[PDB]
Amino acid sequence: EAAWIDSDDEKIKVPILVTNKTKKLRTSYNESKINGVHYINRLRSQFEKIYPRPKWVDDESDINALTKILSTTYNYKDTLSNSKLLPPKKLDIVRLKDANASHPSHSAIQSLSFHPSKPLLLTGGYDKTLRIYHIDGKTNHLVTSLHLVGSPIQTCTFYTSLSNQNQQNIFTAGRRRYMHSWDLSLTAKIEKFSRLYGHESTQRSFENFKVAHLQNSQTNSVHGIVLLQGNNGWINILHSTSGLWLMGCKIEGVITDFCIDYQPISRGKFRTILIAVNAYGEVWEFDLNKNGHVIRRWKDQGGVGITKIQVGGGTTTTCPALQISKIKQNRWLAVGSESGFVNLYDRNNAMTSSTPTPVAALDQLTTTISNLQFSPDGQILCMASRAVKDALRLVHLPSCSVFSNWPTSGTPLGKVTSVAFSPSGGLLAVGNEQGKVRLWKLNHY
Amino acid sequence: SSLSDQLAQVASNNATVALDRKRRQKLHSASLIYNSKTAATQDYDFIFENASKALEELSQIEPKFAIFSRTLFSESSISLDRNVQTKEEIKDLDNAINAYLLLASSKWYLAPTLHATEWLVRRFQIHVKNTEMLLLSTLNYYQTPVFKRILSIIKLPPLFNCLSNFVRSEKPPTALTMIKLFNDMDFLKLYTSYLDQCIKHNATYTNQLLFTTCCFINVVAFNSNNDEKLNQLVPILLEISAKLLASKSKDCQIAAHTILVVFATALPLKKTIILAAMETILSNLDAKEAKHSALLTICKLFQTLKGQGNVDQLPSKIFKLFDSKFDTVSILTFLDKEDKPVCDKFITSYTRSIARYDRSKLNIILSLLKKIRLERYEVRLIITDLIYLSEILEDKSQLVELFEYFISINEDLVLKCLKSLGLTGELFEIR
Amino acid sequence: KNSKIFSPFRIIGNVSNGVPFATGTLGSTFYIVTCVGKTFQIYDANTLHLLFVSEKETPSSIVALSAHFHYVYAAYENKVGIYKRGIEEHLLELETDANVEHLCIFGDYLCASTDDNSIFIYKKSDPQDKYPSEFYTKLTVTEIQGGEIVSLQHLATYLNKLTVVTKSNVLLFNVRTGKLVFTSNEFPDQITTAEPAPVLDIIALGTVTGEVIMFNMRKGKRIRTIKIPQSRISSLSFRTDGSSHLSVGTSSGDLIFYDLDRRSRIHVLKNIHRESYGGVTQATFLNGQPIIVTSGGDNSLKEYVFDPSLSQGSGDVVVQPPRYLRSRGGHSQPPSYIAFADSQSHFMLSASKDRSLWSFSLRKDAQSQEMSQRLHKKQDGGRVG
């Protein structure tokens, strides 16, 4: 049975009663010197009674594979490698340096934006000094800081042309009757749009505008549009380069907000749609690459006064495209109320409904919402009030579950008034009224 | 330690032996049937003879009890004292008792097993010494006065400590307390050991398995939002899932499917372990109900798989095994089911595997692609594998028929896959 | 240089360095001989106090030590010092310039091995005196016979045999006639640990991939194999209180307890020792004891006890996880700033580059304890930043 034979131990003899510990393995009181293999067997039995012989050695000699892989590995989650998506209800935030900390602000932060490709943040508040920071995870500084007197700005944003991408125009507007454009060129040249061509009796303010591309659809002069709000039901679409009134659209009932959804048509063609709400909450969905006339209209399931609508998932204002072929049909729409109830709608079946039911109607933050923005890829929704402290929630979607681990009570959010995302970095930025803008990042991106 | 607890240990050690008349009657008065002042006047022969009558009627309704007649319910058993004999024959005694207890785990709805087990309680003292197997054998009947009785007379083990405010209370212990009993792996390793003995005796049945599975999915539900606890709790539930599939009963096999589906939707597992689970639940699949449930659980297992490589090829030895257990027309009628469960990722991997490891019968893939709708990255990877297949083997009418179907819906997909690989002029050359 | 005012005394606050320790029994006691750089130290294992130190340093650093009953065999650059009660009792100069690597003690024959697969074995002049003092012979393993050495030991019930564990092969010896007896089979990867088993004549040996082979040397086979994904294994042990438990220690700071009667992981332990300082350098069960003594390279020694089971009927299937028991540590990086606490020269404070603060006690070296970073809560309403 042995694979080897020593051929030396069998010719040995040991007097076992020389000492105390080797004299118990005798068998008679007359035997003194014993043979070698007998000696091996005797002390082998002594070993087997000094530690017993368990069953796992004489078990064997090396529908099963579940047990085999389960006994192999420890970490039973694949998410170490790729993960390609978010994990629900527990996200991987970390904190970064406070983005206002280099050169602080004094008023609230009513607008906050990112450059679409360059690593640039824009901050704008009621103290009429629009600052621009270069932001990074360690120490983030102020590139420039334009100040403009007599115009406390409310909302301001970046813009690049889709065609030749070398324009980089800021647009800014406050409660006054003029807005400003800026071609940024690392002493500034800014223009003051105030020429209202068609309608001059519907703007007590310019304090709500968006910017959006469109195609010509007989030629392909892809160019900008400023979309300003009015007072009765009016939202006016201008030009961004020139300043011409392109046209306007009035909905019935008071405008509360609006958003822009593009959709591709062919390889090189696309179509823009404007979505607008009341306080009542019946929306108009009309394209405006042809003349602005309503092609769909339906009604939100609920809301007495709804406050803020934001589309996302594909491309939008906050996540813009660079090449014209890089533009994408959206997926998610979201409508938010003064009661706090945010409905979020899918838009892959709800172009057919004419009264669509919500995918989810969530309510976690109690008071009225002010800002809500999607991720650039459409997995996080970000909701925030302007009423109480720590009034922001993050929602994983398509599962439509609020993240539990963040934000806790101990997060230093402050009374939030604005929020924005990165175009790519997964770098999130929140601003409050007491001045500071803080910076987090999402480690999955 | 101190003297008081230092001899409370020896009091608990020798609680089984009666030392005088008062402790003798306080020990003898424990009974599953009669109350205290009735039970304190019974003798051993009385309960033995009515228990032997209960046993023989229980043995004609179940033919596997005459062995316990021969060795545990014999006439010498009323003289056999427990705590007077050595550790090896007390080991024989209580493993025989455990055999009886798992065997009579089913019969507790009917009173012959109550009168059969009450002499076993009164003589061999299982209500103090052999308490664990008793509790987790009769734990299924927790809304029953037999369990309220047996918990009123039991001395409570250190594991089942959540029940100690349910002794001598008329309320039966509730389902939430049963979950909080099941909610630590010190209890769970015990209960998986017990289920392993039930499997290798085939004493499994439809009520114990139902209760066990329901508490396991409730444990996973409580440990939903605890990632460390859930990852701690994997290798016991999956362990008895694999030990549960090794048996023959359709009920324990679909119970294994139940814990597998709820665990897969509880947390995202890895591709290798979910493929081993898929081939394991396939490798012992016999009855039709097991076929149906296993197909549902395979589809949901693959639906809860994220990350890249999710819709990749299942390999050859799992693919041919899936085709051996499940023919193609069963897949076709399951996809023809009107409820339409979401099975898109499994059907995507099935299409890529039938196109790569069989490459012969493409009527199947065309038919089921007509029968379901499917998303864009899935159909992109399918038509990429079809491009590679159409260039390795010569084109057929079926291949070009499904190709022109993918022309007829969503042209620019196969156009962009040709832009990745060649040109539509070259594809029309290979037409 | 030599001085004339200050004489050096002791390097306090130092527990381990990363050399695998050894253990020894005396009656029903247990002592742990650990290495600290150049001198070693002898703790006990019951209360884990210090007991002994070497009375004077070594020339080089100690590379390998072992322990029989009273005696401690230290091994550095060229020699092996047989020590008693922390006092050197006999040098043994080896017959080479090659640096010694490993050693083992059994019966009469001491056996040390250098760094070129050359094994000096020594023998006691009288089969009654206390330590091997006399050179017996010099075996030499050649590269035909196996790889370069990684351990050696005499596993039990073998009549004057020995087991050299190389990087590719296991090979026995009969040390009386100087003969090789049984080369083993071929092994396809580098093995790095081999510890014997308390069952008859088998040895568990773990590789650089995470598998443990269990070689049966009498049979010349392997019995089982424990596979573990991509773990650089470092230190095996077995538990000998009857209930069979294997324990592997992975240099990623892991300690995995395997059952062997049913091939199951009993409990894993993650990040027990720090990764970057070597991980689990040496971990062992005290024999006949349900405790574990681990030591890392990060200046830390720990004891983990196995509790009794809670299932009084089931027993060996339900195993309680290991608790944490006594441990002795210092900070694992060189200390930045140093103060003296009291006028009596009893306590002193260290703060190290690994950002920990310790209060060492230079009077009695079990009083040294880490200061704790648990903030007093702001009782004016604020939140801790």
């Binding site: - | 959540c162 | 039990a156 009386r176």
Partner: peptide
């Protein structure tokens, strides 16, 4: 009431160990 996960005073019981002294021999 939860399960009393409870430690105790631990004690080092008696060792019982094979020693290697009886593993050598000599030619007589």
């Amino acid at each position: 009431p939860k399960v009393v996960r409870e430690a105790k005073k631990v004690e080092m019981t008696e060792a019982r160990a094979y020693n290697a002294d009886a593993d050598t021999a000599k030619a007589a």
